[PDB]
């Protein structure tokens, strides 16, 4: 199960909750793998008309990807993930062996 957000706190919170949830229904999980951070990097001149000093600032929109994965049937993992979510975290499920 892959968890994406641009909200740092919300992805972090949900990860601990889904792990806690997994042990409740005693599922076999691999420990959460935090995937390389993707940044939307914008280098902007501060002056709006470009007059005066050559002032530049670097803006970052940093998107968080994380993976936790499970050896289970599809039905338990999909039902548990579907109930446990918080709205700003975008979740995708990945199918696994019996």
């Amino acid at each position: 199960i892959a968890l994406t957000s641009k909200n740092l706190r919300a992805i972090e919170k949900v990860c601990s909750d889904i792990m806690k949830g997994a042990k409740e229904k005693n599922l076999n999980v691999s420990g959460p793998v935090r995937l390389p951070v993707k940044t939307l990097r914008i280098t902007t001149r501060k002056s709006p008309c470009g007059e005066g000093t050559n002032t530049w600032d670097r803006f970052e929109l940093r998107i968080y990807k994380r993976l936790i994965d499970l050896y289970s049937q599809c039905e338990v993992v999909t039902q548990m993930t579907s109930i446990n979510i918080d709205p700003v975290v975008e979740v995708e499920v990945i199918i696994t062996d019996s």
Partner: protein, 157 residues
């Protein structure tokens, strides 16, 4: 499908477009952000896809439009913010002030920090353009509210 970088930025643009649209309409009570009177707003948004600083600033610009004297109006708005539990507030009105030479007037009370991450986290700001017949006046309201944890204490019983 599209990349995560594209997806989240397009979401950001949509959120931005909605927020500026909401802010232009805004009257009685502050807008709530995206859902992830109301009938009309919902219907427009579905069609497209198929106390606080901004409120106080908007209230103040409304009083200015009503033609009231600046000192009484600004103090009243500042007072309501301080009284309702702000630990600082700063209000600036820039432009004519019904004169032929432009000027500004600042009305600040409380501590009103400008520095470090407590300022960025806990100071909320709003800018409003007030149209008269001599042109346009700029209102800036800034409210400090740290009331997560407070910036300065030595924390002993």
């Amino acid at each position: 499908p599209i990349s995560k970088k594209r997806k989240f930025i397009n979401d950001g643009v949509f959120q931005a477009e909605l927020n500026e649209f909401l802010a232009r309409i805004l009257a009685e009570d502050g807008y709530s952000g995206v859902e992830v009177r109301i009938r009309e707003l919902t219907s427009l948004v579905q069609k497209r896809f198929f106390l606080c600083a901004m409120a106080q600033a908007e209230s103040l610009r409304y009083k200015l439009l009503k033609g009231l004297a600046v000192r009484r109006a600004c103090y009243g708005v500042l007072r309501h913010i301080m009284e309702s539990g702000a630990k600082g507030c700063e209000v600036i009105v820039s432009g004519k002030l019904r004169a032929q030479r432009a000027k500004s007037m600042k009305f600040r009370d409380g501590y009103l920090i400008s520095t470090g991450e407590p300022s960025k986290r806990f100071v909320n700001t709003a800018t409003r353009s007030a149209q008269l017949k001599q042109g346009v006046l700029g209102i800036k309201v800034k409210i400090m509210l740290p009331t997560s944890i407070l910036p300065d204490n030595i924390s002993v019983l």
